[PDB]
Symmetry: C3
Subunit: 267 residues, 3 copies
C-alpha cells in the first residue's frame, strides 16, 4: 500500500511535464525512501533520472516497494484535472493494475478521484557511473533555456565550451551562426543569479539541439540548472527538487552521436 | 419593421457563441414580445432553444412577426466586428432578404453598418414536454464546465447521479476513471458559489461528453447553470439571461443514444 | 565597414516584422546617411520601401555604400534572440558575405553575437514619382487595421471613398457587406486619436484585402498611418519612424488589379 500526498498538485505535474516529450512509458518505482524513475529516449542518447525524497511530500508512506508503469501522456491528461493548488495524493495497492489520483481542495465539499490504468513496461535500468566531471557550472534555469532556445533556431548542434571563467555556447548552421558568452559572477544583492563555473580541465562538447530543447523543460522545477561536463562522458543537466532531482544524461557528439549505453551498463 | 437594440453588442455575441458550434443554420423568430430560436443538431440528440425577452434589449420594436434564417458562422464573422461596447441595433424590413447590424460607439461619431444576407432554412419546430423532473440542481457555470472538461479526457460518456444531497459525475474510459462528488451548500458570503439541489427522486443519466462540451459553451451567458434531470425525458441545461435564457435539451443514452424526436414531435 | 547601433533591438524587429510577410528577399542598401530598402511582391502589386536616417540610430557609421541582400524570414529568427531591449549593432565589411548582429545587454557583461549569411538578390529597383494625390488622410494605425481586419471578413476587396469631410470604407461580399465611415476631427486631450483629412478631389479606389492585411502589419512602427489616394496612381500607406518610414505603394483595382510596374519604371 502506497500513500504519497503532494502539498500542491502542480508539483507532480511540473515534474511529469519535465520529461514527457522525451520518453512516454516510464516505470515509477516507489520505495520507502521516496519515488525514483529512470527512462531513455528511443534514440538512446538521453537518460532521464528522477528522485523525489519523502521530504518533498506533505505525507508519504510505502509499505512495500512497488513499480508503477505509466503512460505519461495519459497521466498528464489526468494531472491537468487539478485546480493547480490542490492536494494530489497518489495511492496504490499490493499488486496494483491501476493507481488512484485523489485531488482535494481546502474548501472541501469537493474531492475528485481519478484512476490511472497501469501498464507493464520492461525495465532497462542503467547503472549511472560515479565519475568526476572536468567543468561543473550552474546558472539560472531561466537564462539557460533562453540560450538554448535562441541558438537552436540556427543549428542542429549546440556546442558548450568551458575555458577559464568563460562559458561559450556556439551554434553554426546553414543560415548562419551564434555565440553567447557568460562569465562567472556573484550578485549578493539578489544571489539567485550567480554563474558558478568550477573548472579542472577545459571541455568542448557538442550536443543535439533537439535533446537540449527537451532538457530545458525541466526549468519549471528549479530556479537554476546545474550542468556538469566531462571530456568523454555524458553531460549532466540537473534541476533540483525540494529534496530530489530531475537529471538528464546527454550522450555528446564526438561529430558522431554516441549512445548512452556506450557508458552505462544494465543492472 | 424590426429594430432591436443591444446597448452592449457583446451580449448578442455571447448569445450566438453559446450554440454556433452546435448548429450552423438557425431560424430566429422575432415577434412583439421578443426573439426566440430553436435548432436541433444533425444527430437529433441536442435541442437548442433561445429566448430573449424585450426587457433584455435597451430598445426593441417589432411590428409583425418576422423570421430570420441565418448562417451562424457568417453572423459570427460580422458579430466580431464591434468594439464589444458598441450599441448593436438589429434591423430588418418586410419580407427581409438581408438583416442589418448597426454598431454605434459613444466615443465618436463612429457607425459600422453591416448587412448579413438572410437564408431560407426549413422550419423543424419540435414541441417541448418538460414533465416534473425527478431532480433539478444548479451550480456555477464555471464549476460545471471544468467538471465536464476534465472528465471528457477520460471517456466519451459522462454520467450524472443525484442522491441525497450528493451530485456525482463519473467518467469510465480506456485509460481510466474520474468521479467528482459535490454537495449542495448555500453560502451567504457570496451567492454565486452556492450549489443548489432539490431531489424529489434520485436519478442517474449518461450523456455523450461531445454534446456536454458544446453545452458548456453557454457558460458565457450566466455565472450559473441550471440542470434538470428525469429518468424518461431529455436533460435540461439552462443558462439565464436578463429576461431571457438559452436552454439545451439533451437526449440521454438509455448504452444507446436516444434521439430527441422520440420525446419531441413536429409542430 | 558598417557599424549601425539600435538603442533598442525592439526597433529593428518591428521594422522587419512590418513587411516580412509581404516580401521575403530584400536588398538593404546602407548609404552613409542611413539604410534604405525596396521590394515588390511576386504579384507586382505591392511595393514596400524603407528609409532609416542616422538620426534613428543611437550610433551609426558607414564608410562606403554597401548593399546587404537578406532573407527576411531567416533574419527574423536571429531578431527573435536577445531581450528586446538590448543594443543591437549591425556590422559589415568590404564585400561582405555575411552580416554580423551583436546583441548587448546594458546590465550584465553579456554579449551575444550572431552572423547571418547574405544573399545575392538582383536589384529590381523602381523609380518612384509620387505626384500629387487627390486626397490624403491620417488616422490612428490602431483604427485602420481594425477597420481593415473587420471588413476583410466580408470580401476580398475593400473600397476607400473620400467625399466631403467623410472617409468611407466599404466591403461587399457573398455572406453580405459592411461599411464604416469616419469623419475628420481632433481631441487635444489625447491628440494621437485624431482623424485628419485634406481633399482636392474626391477619390474612390478599390484594393485587394489581402494586400491591405499585409500593409496594416506596419502599425507596430507608428501610432498613425498616412494614406494618400489619387485616381490612377498607387495608394500610399505610410508609417513614420523617428527619422525614417516604412511605406507601401499599392496598385489599385480599376475589377482588374493593376501592376506597380505600370506606374514606376526601372532605374
Amino acid at each position: 500500500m502506497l500513500e504519497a500526498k503532494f502539498e500542491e498538485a502542480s508539483l507532480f505535474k511540473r515534474i511529469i511535464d519535465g520529461f514527457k516529450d522525451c520518453v512516454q512509458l516510464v516505470n515509477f518505482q516507489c520505495k520507502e525512501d521516496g519515488i525514483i524513475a529512470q527512462a531513455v529516449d528511443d534514440s538512446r542518447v538521453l537518460l532521464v533520472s528522477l528522485e523525489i525524497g519523502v521530504e518533498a511530500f506533505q505525507e508519504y508512506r510505502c509499505d512495500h516497494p512497488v513499480t508503477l508503469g505509466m503512460d505519461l501522456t495519459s497521466l498528464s491528461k489526468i494531472l491537468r484535472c487539478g485546480n493547480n493548488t490542490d492536494t494530489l495524493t497518489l495511492i496504490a495497492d499490493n499488486t496494483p493494475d491501476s493507481i488512484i489520483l485523489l485531488f482535494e481542495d481546502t474548501k472541501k465539499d469537493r474531492i475528485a478521484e481519478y484512476s490511472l490504468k497501469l501498464m507493464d513496461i520492461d525495465a532497462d535500468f542503467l547503472k549511472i557511473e560515479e565519475l568526476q566531471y572536468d567543468s561543473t557550472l550552474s546558472l539560472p534555469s531561466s537564462e539557460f533555456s533562453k540560450i538554448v532556445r535562441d541558438l537552436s533556431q540556427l543549428s542542429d548542434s549546440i556546442n558548450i565550451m568551458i575555458t577559464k571563467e568563460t562559458i561559450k555556447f556556439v551554434a553554426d548552421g546553414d543560415i548562419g551562426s551564434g555565440s553567447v558568452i557568460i562569465k562567472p559572477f556573484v550578485d549578493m544583492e539578489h544571489p539567485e543569479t550567480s554563474i558558478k563555473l568550477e573548472m579542472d580541465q577545459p571541455v568542448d562538447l557538442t550536443f543535439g539541439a533537439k535533446y537540449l530543447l527537451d532538457i530545458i523543460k525541466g526549468s519549471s522545477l528549479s530556479d537554476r540548472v546545474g550542468i556538469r561536463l566531462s571530456s568523454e562522458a555524458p553531460a549532466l543537466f540537473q534541476f533540483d527538487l525540494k529534496s530530489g532531482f530531475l537529471q538528464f544524461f546527454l550522450a555528446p557528439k564526438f561529430r558522431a552521436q554516441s549512445r548512452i549505453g556506450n557508458f552505462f551498463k544494465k543492472l
